[PDB]
Amino acid sequence: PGLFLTLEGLDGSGKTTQARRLAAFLEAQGRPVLLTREPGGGLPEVRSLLLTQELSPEAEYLLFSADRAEHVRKVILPGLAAGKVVISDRYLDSSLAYQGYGRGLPLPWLREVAREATRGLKPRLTFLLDLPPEAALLEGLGLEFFRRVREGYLALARAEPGRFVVLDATLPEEEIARAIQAHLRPLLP
């Protein structure tokens, strides 16, 4: 059965911090956990490709999608099948926010690509660490871009209000962790 959880937010919003704290927290409860990440959980060498100068946004998304396809097939679905809690530090929503709202690619196309790439796999909960855009720190990742991405993430959360849990990324680390834990307690068990 398993449980699929993701962390999302701008660069520097505390995703990795919270994903790792959550993994350790759940491991301490005796739960089998698999901690993974994008980009690179599927095809580690995609990280080299993604640094290529002057990439079209289309090519950028297609690279993230290639990694995502491998990631879902070889890592996430097998983890879930073994009954693990699988936590991914970034997932599809990162592409929707960055390549969609940030770069301007059409969301329906992103979703059509993803439908095969992800085999339709959706997280049960997505913890969005909402960070002011000026605090964030690929090419052209400036303030205008980060404002679009930040608001994009908030739009995705309003559209799927049961899946997304929106948290103020500027709260103390331990307060955010307790909030994440509270949202999880009824799901585990």
Ligand X SMILES: Nc1ncnc2c1ncn2[C@@H]1O[C@H](COP(=O)(O)OP(=O)(O)O)[C@@H](O)[C@H]1O
Ligand Y SMILES: Nc1ncnc2c1ncn2[C@@H]1O[C@H](COP(=O)(O)OP(=O)(O)OP(=O)(O)O)[C@@H](O)[C@H]1O
Ligand Z SMILES: Cc1cn([C@H]2C[C@H](O)[C@@H](COP(=O)(O)O)O2)c(=O)[nH]c1=O
| Residues making contact with ligand Z (CB under 6 A) | 11, 38-39, 64, 90, 94-95, 98-99, 138
Token pair, residue 102, equals 């940030």
Query: How many Cβ atoms sit within 10 Å of the Cβ of residue 35?
Result: 20
User: For residue 22, which of 46, 37, 45, 6 has the smallest C-alpha distance?
Assistant: 6
57-71 vs 107-117: helix crossing angle, rounded to 10? 30
Minimum CB distance to Mg ion smaller for 26 or for 96: 96
Contacts with ligand Y, residue ranges (CB under 6 A):
9, 11-17, 171-173, 176
Q: Would you say how long the chain is, in residues?
A: 189
Minimum CB distance to ligand Z smaller for 38 or for 70: 38
**CA pair distance 114, 159, nearest whole angstrom:** 18
- 92 binding a copy of itself? (CB under 8 A): no
Closest distance of CB 122 from ligand X, Å = 21
Closest distance of CB 13 from ligand X, Å = 4
Q: Is 16 assigned a ligand-binding role in the annotation?
A: yes
Q: Which helix (H) or strand (E) holds 51?
A: none
Closest distance of CB 189 from ligand Z, Å = 30
**CA pair distance 39, 20, nearest whole angstrom:** 16
Closest distance of CB 112 from ligand X, Å = 28
Minimum CB distance to ligand X smaller for 17 or for 181: 17
Query: How many Cβ atoms sit within 10 Å of the Cβ of residue 42?
Result: 23
8 Å CB contact between 124 and 106: no
User: Of the listed pieces 15-23, 26-34, 154-162, 177-185, which binds Mg ion according to CB under 5 A?
Assistant: 15-23
Annotated binding-site residues for ATP read 9-16
User: What is the binding site for Mg ion (CB under 5 A)?
Assistant: 6, 8-11, 13, 15-16, 65, 68, 91, 93, 114, 117, 126, 130-131
